[PDB]
Curated annotation (Swiss-Prot), chain A:
Provenance organism: Escherichia coli (strain K12)
Family: Belongs to the universal ribosomal protein uS8 family.
Domain of life: Bacteria
Protein name (record): Small ribosomal subunit protein uS8
Single GO biological process annotation from the record: cytoplasmic translation
UniProtKB/Swiss-Prot annotation, chain C:
Organism annotation: Escherichia coli (strain K12)
Stored PANTHER family: MITOCHONDRIAL RIBOSOMAL PROTEIN S5
Name of this chain's protein: Small ribosomal subunit protein uS5
This protein's GO CC annotations: cytoplasm; cytosol; cytosolic small ribosomal subunit
Stated consequence of mutating R103S: In strain: NEA-319; neamycin resistant
Presence of the UniProt keyword rRNA-binding in the record: yes
Family: Belongs to the universal ribosomal protein uS5 family.
Outcome when changing S13P: In strain: SPCR13 and SPCR15; spectinomycin resistant. Not a ram mutation
Free-text note on domains in this protein's UniProt record: The N-terminal domain interacts with the head of the 30S subunit; the C-terminal domain interacts with the body and contacts protein uS4. The interaction surface between uS4 and uS5 is involved in control of translational fidelity.
Keywords linked to the UniProt accession: Acetylation, Antibiotic resistance, Ribonucleoprotein, Ribosomal protein, RNA-binding, rRNA-binding
Molecular functions (GO terms): rRNA binding; structural constituent of ribosome
Domain S5 DRBM: residue ranges: 2-65
Assembly and oligomerization: Part of the 30S ribosomal subunit. Contacts proteins uS4 and uS8. With proteins uS4 and uS5 encircles the mRNA as it enters the ribosome, which may play a role in mRNA helicase processivity. Can be cross-linked to mRNA. In collided ribosomes contacts ribosome rescue factor SmrB.
Swiss-Prot record, chain D:
Keyword Repressor: no
Effect in UniProt of substituting K87Q: Confers low-level resistance to streptomycin and a 15% decrease in the translational elongation rate
Cystine crosslinks: none
Function (record text): With S4 and S5 plays an important role in translational accuracy. Interacts with and stabilizes bases of the 16S rRNA that are involved in tRNA selection in the A site and with the mRNA backbone. Located at the interface of the 30S and 50S subunits, it traverses the body of the 30S subunit contacting proteins on the other side and probably holding the rRNA structure together. The combined cluster of proteins S8, S12 and S17 appears to hold together the shoulder and platform of the 30S subunit.
Family under the similarity heading: Belongs to the universal ribosomal protein uS12 family.
Modification N6-acetyllysine, positions: K107
GO MF terms, alphabetically ordered: misfolded RNA binding; rRNA binding; structural constituent of ribosome; tRNA binding
Modified residues (3-methylthioaspartic acid): D88
Protein known as: Small ribosomal subunit protein uS12
Subunit: Part of the 30S ribosomal subunit. Contacts proteins S8 and S17. Interacts with ArfA. May interact with IF1 in the 30S initiation complex.
InterPro entries: NA-bd_OB-fold (IPR012340), Ribosomal_uS12 (IPR006032), Ribosomal_uS12_bac (IPR005679)
The encoding gene: rpsL
Pfam families: Ribosom_S12_S23
UniProtKB/Swiss-Prot annotation, chain G:
Cross-referenced SMART domains: Ribosomal_S4, S4
Species in which this protein is naturally found: Escherichia coli (strain K12)
Presence of keyword Nucleotidyltransferase: no
NCBIfam families referenced in this protein's UniProt entry, alphabetically: PRK05327.1, rpsD_bact
Family matches, as PROSITE patterns: RIBOSOMAL_S4, S4
Name of the protein: Small ribosomal subunit protein uS4
Length: 129, 80, 150, 123, 82, 111, 205
RNA sequence: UAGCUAGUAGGUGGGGUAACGGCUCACCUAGGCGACGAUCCCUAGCUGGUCUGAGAGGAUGACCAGCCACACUGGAACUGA
RNA sequence: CCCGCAGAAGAAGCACCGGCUAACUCCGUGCCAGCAGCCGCGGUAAUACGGAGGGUGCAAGCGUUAAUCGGAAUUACUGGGCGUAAAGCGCACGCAGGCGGUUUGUUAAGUCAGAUGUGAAAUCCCCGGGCUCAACCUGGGAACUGCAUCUGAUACUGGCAAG
């Protein structure tokens, strides 16, 4: 169901990257926008966008360099059925630090790199490769 | 004030006694799943105060019976 | 610089109208010592005939694998048919410590450090290619600067 | 598969029952060896082998294989039993010790003296 | 009785005592409150070998603990400032 | 042991004396077991053959009662007492425990 | 805890010069090296992938004259020590007292170097040392004592020691019949033909 | 093994213990525990650790040290901090 | 612990060698006698038995057996399957339980930060020291992944309120 709409968007990317589709449309939210902001910040997606008032729709433009996709893989780590939380140095690094995780800390939604520098962690979302 | 827990009434009238069903969230050591655990504890009461359909604050004390080593202080609202 | 070697040889059977005729197939993997990983299987009625075609086919279909110094850039998962291969970089650690079938592909690629532990099926012909697929899909921190950075 | 299923009932492990019914945390045992029989091997092979029904000190009666060429074992004189399983005469889960207690070692043997209780000859 | 005393944890034919504050009713290597220092009576002529913290024992002396003839002798061997 | 068994030079006895009686003996003193056994072999005859099995140095034991359990035999002692672990075995399975002060009363009953 | 048998059989079975027959002469000439490892050694040199892993360990053990149980500790010590595990293996073996006695040219062979060290004729920093496995560290000076000095065993060794490589990591000296360990030997200064990656592999499984 | 508990659960008063208490009595009320496994059955001292394992875990509880229980079996009291 | 005396003198065995698995021929025996951890050898050329020669591994130890883990991703939380190999209840409605769209305010339980106390010592690990080296012993440090309390952070989950 709509139950887990965070992991929906992670599947929307991988299907869009596999299918070679440019524009991907979906529902919007508070955390839903802030995850996509971190994807553009490091430089994975091309750009994020929102359009609407009563029912805003999250439009994520997908970036492509070669014929192969930009993002290698994106998977839901922490899920409704089982949550994962990481303190300060317990925060795991993906592919020897290459790429970024997405981690929701107290001050805001950050990466595994940025969470180490500030000196505070929280609920990990997903691993961007 | 001394440390407290957020447990609810659960038993109405035990003839000048009151149990407190305490909910809590704990990470399971092996799998890492978060299961709700229920800690039922006997508490001493005064002047037949409010019973079930309420949530009652709790604090440690000298045991006035077998087990029953806690005392109440404050209760949220009235009806369930 | 050719640095070529065989993994294993396995006798097979046909069983025609007359009777059983046995062929031979030798798996081989090759490399230049710094990337350029390649392999070949082939078959023949003799042992020295089959190994020749294996080394001959190993020259073509050769692709670059990106390494930091003498180690992997990161840990990478790779699968082929029914085999499942993991690996960890482990910088200058103990090194080239692994069993046959996957021993050849690592040492000739250039790695003198990374740990294997191949799960699932451990068939000599399926355990190879899971490396080359798992090393091809692996990307380089310098040349991923297209997507990375800006 | 699902985590919430495994929270109710955790993962089960097989007890892995031992292949030595004597057990008692005992490497070797002894037993009375009442009758020494001669029985043919399994389906694939053909031979005549020396095997005896050994009543152990614990109470359990169990058959035991006699290694080496020939033996003086029979009726009385309690023998030691090393154990371990080799499959040939159906039912055998043990081996007798040679050169221990009352049991004689193999005569005129030179290689593999540790096995079969053969002493080093004076040279 | 709270007492400061030397427990032998070293080796056979090579003693290494451990000066420690414990109850007299407890065993030598048994239960104790807490360690203070160490004294090897073998050792050699060198910078280290005898160490003892007078700030810790003098606390326990004030609380009502007695001192054995050896612990006293080791305090009066090393002195305080010397 | 090898000589006595091979001495017959045949797989069995030539006649019907094969029927025999077994005995189990443990005497408190070491001097007797060797001495009286010689006198116990004097009463032996061609018809019925009697043999001693596992002569003991003293008392009684688990492996001794087990020795009489495998092959049916009388368990006798010049002088012996039953151990706590010995009584449990003797009382359970069907056996016979008889101790004799003198060797004469023994030499008569075995016969 | 020593071999005592034929030293050239260890050289033959490996198929490499262990420097056990050195002493007075050198460079073999007469040998029968390799070619018949056993009685049926003239059979083809084809050998398993596992066997060449063990064959490397035996080469290093038969050079330095170390047993598997004593040699198990050097891998365990080299693994726990930092940096490369293979480089630490030969570094701990190179720091043995018998070998440091052999490198300076006191003993004409490696077994003879262990031989002389056993007799309490070698003295580190003044004090005598019996054990050949004594670990030599930086700034340690090692020398022959006054008793049994200038003997034909030690004198002939130091004469022909000049004809060898002459290692840079320790000073030969041989003027007053003494030696000094300058620093820990480099990777380039040892090994070369003997590989550390092959021996380091065997312990992983 | 799905139902298990009459001093059983709680109160009041009295007695009791060095000390709170069904600790032990009288009376009063009908509760208490339990699917988050009560009760019953089988086995077992527990822990720092030991052994194995890349880790997670698994097995284990000699020696060393902490706590507990026991002192031929069963039961009870005295002396004394 | 040190010094002297005499002389190679007083001191090496055990398994194994068909593949797995480092290490081979001959002789004898001929589905006999035996080997064997697994798949298997022997019925007249046995590198698989027995002996011999040779060899390999290891050493005052070497084997067998028993015992636990590893291998075993073969109870798989990390880290597996469920069309045809072992496996989706015959199907459905559903209580407890698990989980839940999206917005604002709030609470600060879960979560995260910092501090304090405790987590005995030993042990393990790291850097040193002392027994001729080592085992052993030992200084300090690290760690003890923990639990509790107190003061903060409010993204996410939960509670509560209005949507």
């Amino acid at each position: 169901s709509m139950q887990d709409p965070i992991a929906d968007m992670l599947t929307r990317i991988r299907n869009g990257q596999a299918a070679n589709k440019a524009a991907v449309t979906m529902p919007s939210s508070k955390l839903k926008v802030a995850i996509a902001n971190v994807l553009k910040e490091e430089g994975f997606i091309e750009d994020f966008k929102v359009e609407g008032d009563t029912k805003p729709e999250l439009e994520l433009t997908l970036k492509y360099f070669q014929g192969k996709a930009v993002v290698e893989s994106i998977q839901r780590v922490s899920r409704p059925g089982l949550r994962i939380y990481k303190r300060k140095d317990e925060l795991p690094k993906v592919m020897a630090g290459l790429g970024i995780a997405v981690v929701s800390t107290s001050k805001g939604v950050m990466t595994d790199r940025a969470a180490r520098q500030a000196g505070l962690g929280g609920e990990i979302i997903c691993y961007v490769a | 004030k001394i440390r407290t827990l957020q447990g609810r009434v659960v038993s109405d009238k035990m003839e000048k006694s009151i149990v407190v069903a305490i909910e809590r969230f704990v990470k399971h050591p092996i799998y890492g799943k978060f299961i709700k655990r229920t800690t039922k504890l006997h508490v001493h009461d005064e002047n037949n105060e409010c019973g079930i359909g309420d949530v009652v604050e709790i604090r440690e004390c000298r045991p006035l019976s077998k087990t029953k080593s806690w005392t109440l202080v404050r209760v949220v609202e009235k009806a369930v | 610089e050719l640095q070529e070697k065989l993994i294993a040889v396995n006798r097979v059977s046909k069983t025609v109208k007359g009777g059983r005729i046995f062929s031979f197939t030798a798996l081989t993997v090759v490399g230049d010592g710094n990337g350029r990983v390649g392999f070949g299987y082939g078959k023949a009625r003799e042992v020295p005939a089959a190994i020749q075609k294996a080394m001959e086919k190993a020259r073509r279909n050769m692709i670059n694998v990106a390494l930091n110094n003498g180690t992997l850039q990161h840990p990478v998962k790779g699968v082929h048919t029914g085999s499942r291969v993991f690996m960890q970089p482990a910088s200058e650690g103990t090194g080239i410590i692994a069993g046959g079938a996957m021993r050849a592909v690592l040492e000739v690629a250039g790695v003198h450090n990374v740990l294997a532990k191949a799960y699932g099926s451990t068939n000599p012909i399926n355990v190879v290619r899971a490396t080359i697929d798992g090393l091809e899909n692996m990307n380089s921190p310098e040349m991923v600067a297209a997507k990375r950075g800006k | 598969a699902t985590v919430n299923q495994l929270v109710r009932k955790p993962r089960a492990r097989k007890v892995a029952k031992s292949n030595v019914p004597a057990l008692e945390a005992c490497p070797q045992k002894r037993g009375v060896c009442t009758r020494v029989y001669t029985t043919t091997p399994k389906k694939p092979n053909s031979a005549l082998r020396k095997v005896c029904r050994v009543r152990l000190t614990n109470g359990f009666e169990v058959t035991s294989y006699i290694g080496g060429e020939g033996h003086n074992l029979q009726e009385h004189s309690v023998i030691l039993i090393r154990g371990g399983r080799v499959k040939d005469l159906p039912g055998v889960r043990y081996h007798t010790v040679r050169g221990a207690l009352d049991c004689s070692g193999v005569k005129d043997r030179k290689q593999a003296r540790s096995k079969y209780g053969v002493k080093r000859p004076k040279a | 009785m709270v007492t400061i005393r030397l427990a032998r944890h070293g080796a056979k034919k090579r003693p290494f005592y451990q000066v420690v504050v414990a109850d007299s009713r407890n065993a030598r290597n048994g239960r104790f409150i807490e360690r203070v220092g160490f004294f090897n009576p073998i050792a050699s002529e060198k910078e280290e070998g005898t160490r003892l913290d007078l700030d810790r024992i003098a606390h326990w002396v004030g609380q009502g603990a007695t001192i054995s003839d050896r612990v006293a002798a080791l305090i009066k061997e090393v002195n305080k400032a010397a | 042991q090898q000589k006595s068994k091979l001495e017959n030079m045949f797989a069995n006895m030539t006649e019907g004396e094969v029927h025999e009686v077994n005995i189990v003996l443990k005497a408190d003193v070491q001097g007797s077991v060797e001495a009286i056994s010689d006198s116990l072999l004097k009463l032996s005859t061609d018809e019925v053959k009697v043999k001693i099995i596992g002569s003991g140095v003293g008392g009684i034991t688990e492996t001794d009662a087990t020795l009489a359990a495998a092959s049916n035999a009388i368990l006798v002692g010049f002088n012996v007492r039953a151990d706590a672990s010995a009584r449990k075995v003797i009382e359970a399975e069907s056996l016979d425990l008889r101790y004799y002060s003198v060797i004469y009363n023994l030499i008569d009953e075995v016969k | 805890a020593r071999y005592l048998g034929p030293k050239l059989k260890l050289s033959r079975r490996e198929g490499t010069d262990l420097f056990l027959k050195s002493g007075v002469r050198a460079i073999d000439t007469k040998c029968k090296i390799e070619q018949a490892p056993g009685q049926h050694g003239a059979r083809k040199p084809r050998l398993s992938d596992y066997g060449v892993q063990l064959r490397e360990k035996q080469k290093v053990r038969r050079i330095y004259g170390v047993l598997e149980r004593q040699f198990r500790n050097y891998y365990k010590e080299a693994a726990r020590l930092k940096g490369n595990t293979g480089e630490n293996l030969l570094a701990l073996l190179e720091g043995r007292l018998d070998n440091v006695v052999y490198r300076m040219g006191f003993g004409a062979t490696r077994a003879e170097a262990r031989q002389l060290v056993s007799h309490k004729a070698i003295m580190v920093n003044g004090r005598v040392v019996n054990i050949a496995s004594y670990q030599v560290s930086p700034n340690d000076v090692v020398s022959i004592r006054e008793k049994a000095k200038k003997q034909s065993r030690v004198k002939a060794a130091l004469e022909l020691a000049e004809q060898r490589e002459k290692p840079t990591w320790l000073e030969v000296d041989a003027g007053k019949m003494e030696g000094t360990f300058k620093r820990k030997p480099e990777r380039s200064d040892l090994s070369a033909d003997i590989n550390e990656h092959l021996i380091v592999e065997l312990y992983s499984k």
